[PDB]
Symmetry: D2
Subunit: 387 residues, 4 copies
């Protein structure tokens, strides 16, 4: 259940229960099979249903069918999706915020009018390309070259860790159009890559430890002709978009660990009351009660932090420090919460028949899949040295 402590007003609490019911009747009985087979056969249908329900494009303005609400609604929807299935949560985050937000913020009129109608309804899949095989944290050191020949850009390089790679029809890929600039950041430029262009291909899916079901593969570029009209933002100014969007991406993806540990508690609490030992329920022992108290306090603290930070950005007060800090704290707490939940189940929590094993593997992604904790602490640290 949930409490009104989060300060959720009208049209926000009803959406929570609606998403809960939808994911419990559709997504909840399928998370196990998704994690087992490492694939999601019902991906297109699920995306169509999400587009019809109006959760896709939640942050997009009301011009092409978006909802036009704040980030808090997106945060709670991401939290509920991660609570239902952690693997689908990363894909939803990459689709709704990693791609759509860059299109609605820096995309021009003709640009967003072409892709968003086919992206909000759930037809196209929105992927993002930043990291590279030789640049995980140092995103500004990318080697993807983009030479200019008239009104066409020829990209020749490779990407890695691309969420929803082979399924994405439109991909926001950052390319370094100028490798001779004095600042390394001034050379990168964002381009809208579309499926079906000559010279574009994708590799096989990666076999990850967790998040099994979210497709991820290597991107290959070989003489790919990118039109000049597909540029995002301005030329040689791609850093002012990537750096400004990565904060919102870390902010929205912070709801992931929230829903993960929420599901952890929702699975742990009834088990501690049903399972009995030493003549009584195991949930009455002081150690189990202390663990429950710690997990509940950590979950509530992280949820309130994320919600209060999301409410600030809805009013126009965005900071790079807080967006990284909230997701760092949420992931670092959700890891320990999942460990304690696996511990509370005992031997039964060690087999893959229970979803407790998936919660730990999924919680580890938010520490390395959305920037490492070291980079987050560095971003927070540099925020104080600038005063």
């Amino acid at each position: 259940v949930d409490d009104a402590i989060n300060g959720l007003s009208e049209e926000q609490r009803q959406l929570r229960q609606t998403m809960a019911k939808f994911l419990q009747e559709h997504l909840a009985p399928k998370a196990q099979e998704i994690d087992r087979s490492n694939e999601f056969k019902n991906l297109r249908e699920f995306w169509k249903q999400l587009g019809n329900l109006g959760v896709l494009g939640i942050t997009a303005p009301v011009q092409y069918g978006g909802s036009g609400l704040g980030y808090l609604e997106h945060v709670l929807v991401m939290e509920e999706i991660s609570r239902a299935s952690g693997a689908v949560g990363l894909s939803y985050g990459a689709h709704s915020n990693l791609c759509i937000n860059q299109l609605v913020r820096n995309g021009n009129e003709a640009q967003k009018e072409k892709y968003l109608p086919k992206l909000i309804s759930g037809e196209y899949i929105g992927a993002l390309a930043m990291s590279e095989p030789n640049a995980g944290s140092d995103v500004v050191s990318m080697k993807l070259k983009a030479e200019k020949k008239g009104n066409h850009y020829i990209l020749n390089g490779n990407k890695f860790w691309i969420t929803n790679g082979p399924d994405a029809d439109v991909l926001i890929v950052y390319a370094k159009t100028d490798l001779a600039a004095v600042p390394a950041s001034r050379g990168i430029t964002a381009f809208i890559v579309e499926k079906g262009m000559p010279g574009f291909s994708t590799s096989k899916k990666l076999d990850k430890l967790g998040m099994r079901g979210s497709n991820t593969c290597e991107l290959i570029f070989e003489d790919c002709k990118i039109p000049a009209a597909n540029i995002l933002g301005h030329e040689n100014k791609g850093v002012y978009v990537l750096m400004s969007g990565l904060d919102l991406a870390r902010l929205v993806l912070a709801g992931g660990p929230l829903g993960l540990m929420q599901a952890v508690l929702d699975h742990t609490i009834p088990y501690l009351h049903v399972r009995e030992a030493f003549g009584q329920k195991i949930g009455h022992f002081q150690l189990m009660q202390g663990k429950m108290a710690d997990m509940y306090t950590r979950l509530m603290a992280c949820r309130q932090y994320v919600y209060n930070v999301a409410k600030a950005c809805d009013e126009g007060h965005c900071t790079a420090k807080d967006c990284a800090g909230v997701i760092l704290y949420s992931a670092e707490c959700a890891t320990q919460v999942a460990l304690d939940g696996i511990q509370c189940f005992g031997g039964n929590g060690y087999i893959n028949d229970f979803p407790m094993g998936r919660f730990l593997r999924d919680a580890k992604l938010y520490e390395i899949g959305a920037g490492t904790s070291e980079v987050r602490r560095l971003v927070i640290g540099r925020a104080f040295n600038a005063d």
Copy 2:
């Protein structure tokens, strides 16, 4: 510098700024001397000045001279007072909540009219008596007998850990009238004693690790004559006012750890830029940046948690489990933040010349004061065994 992310009204921000301005001029410079001498000669004058500001009865009705504000503003004032001096913060918390807030919720009209105006204007100091030398956590096992004869109650016994003891003019003392009743909880009765009654003798102050300046002494009752009109709550059913006061005292007291963390951050963050090591400022090292990130994230998470829980209580969504959780989390995080703040200073954090040593000793009280930390875990755990 506090951020607007906390989600406060403009009047609340103005009140916070006014408190910061008032305490910086009158309490912040002499904060170290109060800890060094364990005495506050200007206690009654500072209490009168606070009464002129209306912060003493900030949760009391306006008809008694109070401000009539909610618990959120009370937590704000607590955090602001604890930001300058932790001992004065604890004293204000024991005065405004344990005595003033208790009478407005369970006292009669005459009992309120007699005591509240002087308590709000700073004329009388309030105190609460729950702990005993033989019963610190198990308050139900108190042995203070309160046998009655006619229209007077004959109290006989001693109580320990009484905050603001020697300086309090009106005290709320919980006593046990019927010790032979089968229900151990249904035998307590709250009495409102005052200075001047024959038999009410206070002991000397107690020298403690922190919170120096708060007068704590042992109360001694030897055949005292308490009139039948100074009864708080109902006769032989004082357990309900005792737990109602206990559930709300942990919420307003959470500002103490918040204020201490704010103080240690406002002392550390500037200090890391006016200190040189290896030819550079110590604030530029990645380990110090990680320490700053951890401290800032913990402070922000605890503050948002406490604020969202306090705002929920203003609309009738009160819960003892949430209050115990927030106070436990705030104390546990403030202890670690105070431990880490000393390491940032290096050697300048292990001497009384810097306030970094005082904030650590004061933060330890919140883990053992107003209920033990393990008792909080037990209370939180027992809240799930009834669902």
Copy 3:
């Protein structure tokens, strides 16, 4: 890559390097295959090769083909095998210790001569059957009962969480022979069960999150006619045999967490010296150096702890508190070190191509295997309450 701080003798150092060169060509290159297939195809061949080396009966007397060494050599061999493959290490320990030690400490002159030769030689595999589906930590509440049908014992019930179930040829099973005794412990009795006896069978191998490749199943007893000569210990004396072996299995299995915490460091340190970020190797950053230092200090502390506690048990002074404390501390520290070790690889540590995920999944077992992290603290606390 180890250091001489352990204080082991020259003979014990030879066994350390002997297994080092053997496991790195026989067990290490196939660890990923065993993990992904969850089936040790060369299980019996590897067991026979280990029996040729004498590491199976390393704690057995030299009369039955053993080695005659102490518990420290067994602990170091277990640590090395767990470093090579944590899944195979658990099976090796649960066979060697939990069979040979239980047989030599409580078996008569005939039972030792009958089973120990082929058990040490590797032809017979051993296992311990104490846990139940309804009793993991509360082993005294077992439901398996035995009834005397003349000079025979008809065992009825089921056993769960047995390592090497379908592979063990000789199994030690505890069965309650009396239920009318006032103490519940006075009814438990130990029996020797061979493979292929009428009424003995295995249901199916279960799948676990970690320790993949170690065969675990459910034991089913359907009117099993165990002879009276197969009783281990004495009549109605199984708990004294069980608790004696329970204290020794915790010390021997402590090398598992030690092995995993050594392997994560042996795989992490050479990785930070290769990958470069921001123009330099990631190993030169302070945030990585601090984590490496913490992991190394934790590993060394746990290793010295286990090695010093092991030496005390060979002299003739063993305690149940230390045996639980060492395994609890080792499991917790190994889990916390693997958590950082996966993060040190960045995105590469989240895929199955690297054994970091396997090391993490195998580390969680020792917190919920061979006892429970909660019950160990209870056993430790009950030691002080008895003094």
Copy 4:
């Protein structure tokens, strides 16, 4: 009571028993006056008593007045020290390890007969001086210049945080003779200072937060006069001289927090078995049992590590990395163990009538003093990156 599990021989156990029976009724019964007044009335008498037993020369041979034992006996006797009274615990380490052994290991025959026969016999007090206000972490960036005018060096500058300052008769002061050399390590040179030299003076003693009783003040050098024969080591080659005693310091001072943990355990275990709450002793609750288990496991883990490293050091194998790791882990564990011990006492652990707060304030020294944890982590990182 300590057990033989630590790995001590018969002579070492007898030495531990002698220290336990000698420190009582002489030291410990007066650690509360030393803590309250920050003054040792019979410091010189206690030092003379220690000199009669030979603990001051535990590492020095019998030729000069010591006992001729190894560093294991030193780290053992420094655990009994600071156990009865943590205040005087730092003075013994600064006298024996920092001054006596520094002259024994890196001294000539002439200097090995003028000061050491006085220091080992307790007639003189020794101390080391390397830190300064501008260099507390960057020891190679000193500012104290040393100009040569023949056969006498004139020291000019200032130093801070010198242990045993106002009472040491022999002080080893490090000064830079060549402030123009490019390598900072090539300009440092060690010197021997004796009380009563012209230009040398001691400032006011510092009122530290904890460890009150171990004198510490500021050294002022104004046109000093030290003969050339008092140079320790070689001129312009004090790099290896400085960073050789700093390693044995970390190795030997690691027993400091071990004694603090032993003291808080010897004070916590009996108190939990005499204090009753809710009709039962507080030591029987599962939370207090878990706290005792964690404290005991941490103490046993930190104790075996330091002892094994000392055993390895007594044979030729020395490493600064392990010497820093053992003391940093010991301090980090002792802080939490003191926090838990104060938590187990509740209200009584806060007043100054109990040594709970004293042991907490004493434990914080080893984390910031004698080398911060960041310096040790950086040293371990540099040692790992060199290979």
